[PDB]
Amino acid sequence: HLDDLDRNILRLLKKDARLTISELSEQLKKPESTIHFRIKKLQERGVIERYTIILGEQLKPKHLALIVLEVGDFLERYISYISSTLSALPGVLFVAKSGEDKIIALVGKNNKDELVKFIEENITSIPNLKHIQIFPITEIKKGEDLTGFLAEV
Amino acid sequence: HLDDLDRNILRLLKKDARLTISELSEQLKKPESTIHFRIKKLQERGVIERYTIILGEQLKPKHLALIVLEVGKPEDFLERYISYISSTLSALPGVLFVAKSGEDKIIALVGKNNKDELVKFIEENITSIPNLKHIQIFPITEIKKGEDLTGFLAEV
Numbered sequence: 001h002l003d004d005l006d007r008n009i010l011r012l013l014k015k016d017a018r019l020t021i022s023e024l025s026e027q028l029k030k031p032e033s034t035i036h037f038r039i040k041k042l043q044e045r046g047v048i049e050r051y052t053i054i055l056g057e058q059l060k061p062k063h064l065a066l067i068v069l070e071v072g073d074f075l076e077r078y079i080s081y082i083s084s085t086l087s088a089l090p091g092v093l094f095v096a097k098s099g100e101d102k103i104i105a106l107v108g109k110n111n112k113d114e115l116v117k118f119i120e121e122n123i124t125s126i127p128n129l130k131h132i133q134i135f136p137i138t139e140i141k142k143g144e145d146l147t148g149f150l151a152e153v
Numbered sequence: 154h155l156d157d158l159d160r161n162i163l164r165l166l167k168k169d170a171r172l173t174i175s176e177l178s179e180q181l182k183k184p185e186s187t188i189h190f191r192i193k194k195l196q197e198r199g200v201i202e203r204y205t206i207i208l209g210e211q212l213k214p215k216h217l218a219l220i221v222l223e224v225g226k227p228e229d230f231l232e233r234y235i236s237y238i239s240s241t242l243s244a245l246p247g248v249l250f251v252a253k254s255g256e257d258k259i260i261a262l263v264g265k266n267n268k269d270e271l272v273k274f275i276e277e278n279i280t281s282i283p284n285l286k287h288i289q290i291f292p293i294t295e296i297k298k299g300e301d302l303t304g305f306l307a308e309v
């Protein structure tokens with residue numbers, strides 16, 4: 001399906017999605033036609049799903065915590081309720097189900113006491129409620145751009 | 154300092170960064186030269202940090218897991234030991250995502266294609282790490298907010 005030309009195109013566009021057809025041709029030493037037709041195929045077959053931007057600077061939250069929460073058939077539904085409630089809240093960047101059972105959230109605020117207060121009013125406050133682990137993120141070694149990607153507004 | 158027009162431009166670009174200035178000016182009802190200037194300015198200040206693509210399900214990992222490691226004992230040695238495990242993990246295929254929590258934990262996001270490749274991954278690269286007090290594995294069953302994370306982090 002994908003050969004090395006497709007993969008090289010995708011790698012360049014992951015670093016800088018502004019790169020035009022003549023630019024990729026000059027960087028990849030392939031004719032402009034060839035590249036044009038490859039890109040057009042990656043887009044029609046959904047391999048490139050979407051073009052977006054990474055936010056930097058004053059729009060990445062300063063303090064991040066990862067939270068894993070465990071609730072104690074009504075169960076499918078209660079996790080659905082908690083997770084839509086968390087999804088609607090500002091500074092909640094990522095929400096996922098895990099097993100039956102569990103919710104993973106990444107939350108971010110600009111003040112650490114604001115992040116404590118937020119946990120504490122919106123998460124530790126959920127009824128039935130067996131366990132919660134909070135993992136404040138002190139540094140990111142790989143995937144630093146994730147915050148700028150998930151960050152809203 | 155950001156105003157409503159700054160935010161509105163960013164929202165649309167976060168939506169679809171293929172949107173050109175003339176399309177943004179039509180959608181926002183602002184002269185083209187204002188949009189243009191605002192975009193150059195956000196790019197210069199690093200508010201728009203980077204333009205990227207999100208990969209489609211052919212290149213996304215089908216099975217994702219979050220891993221939480223807690224080190225028992227490697228204080229200057231703890232810091233250095235975590236760096237070592239961080240760098241070892243980062244160099245591995247499928248590793249999305251590595252972060253340090255507090256002085257003693259490593260958080261990783263791993264994608265593979267089966268259950269299975271993940272089990273085999275944990276056998277080989279996680280339970281082989283010496284001096285770990287705790288290992289937790291949280292399979293991602295369903296992403297509710299942020300589903301395009303794995304298309305963003307997917308390596309090719």
Ligand SMILES: [Au+]
Pocket residue numbers: 065115116119134136
């Ligand atoms: Au916290």
Ligand SMILES: [Au+]
Pocket residue numbers: 271272275276
């Ligand atoms: Au395992």
